[PDB]
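Work Package 3 (structural annotation) set out to generate three-dimensional models for the target panel prioritized at the project kickoff. During this period the team completed the workflow that converts sequence records into discrete structure tokens, so that structures can be stored uniformly alongside our sequence database. As a representative example, we reproduce one entry of 199 residues exactly as it appears in the project archive.
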Amino acid sequence: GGYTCGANTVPYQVSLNSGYHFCGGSLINSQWVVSAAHCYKSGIQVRLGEDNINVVEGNEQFISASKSIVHPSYNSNTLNNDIMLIKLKSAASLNSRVASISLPTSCASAGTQCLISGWGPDVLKCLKAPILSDSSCKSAYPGQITSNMFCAGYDAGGPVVCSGKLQGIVSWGSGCNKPGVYTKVCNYVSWIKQTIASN
């Protein structure tokens, strides 16, 4: 179950702020964040180094987003391809509390434990959970799971990290025997790398 992570123990976790915290994201290099496409809105400020999002604790960096790129195939009705890129107006200063997370070179296997993190209650919360089998995932949500999603279990846009790689983005679910559903990042690595290299 969920627990308090501890301040800055997830240094790639970002908060997206439009006047309030509305979604999480993951820092993938000094200039770029990955989040969920369903988090898209105007006027995004990226907040790095956060623990308590309501208190300035001394390790934060606040940087305006300069560009947002929603995946070309994003379908908001089904949440298929629920992934977006956010460019920072200026490069983050990387340190022990503000660090990038590596993209995977291959997909993760069912049964691998992952760290899922996010807010939602003002400090960062964490959950360790294994990737579920395809059958368990699709049986929980008949007709709704595509090859661009996976489930884990037993803050939209936040990271799912497995074996040191960003394998998922918090996308949707009904757990509020219904596990969380995550965008399958390994399907998008080419698109991520090309899109950031061209922007």
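Residues 11-100+191-197 form a domain with the Thrombin, subunit H fold (CATH 2.40.10.10).
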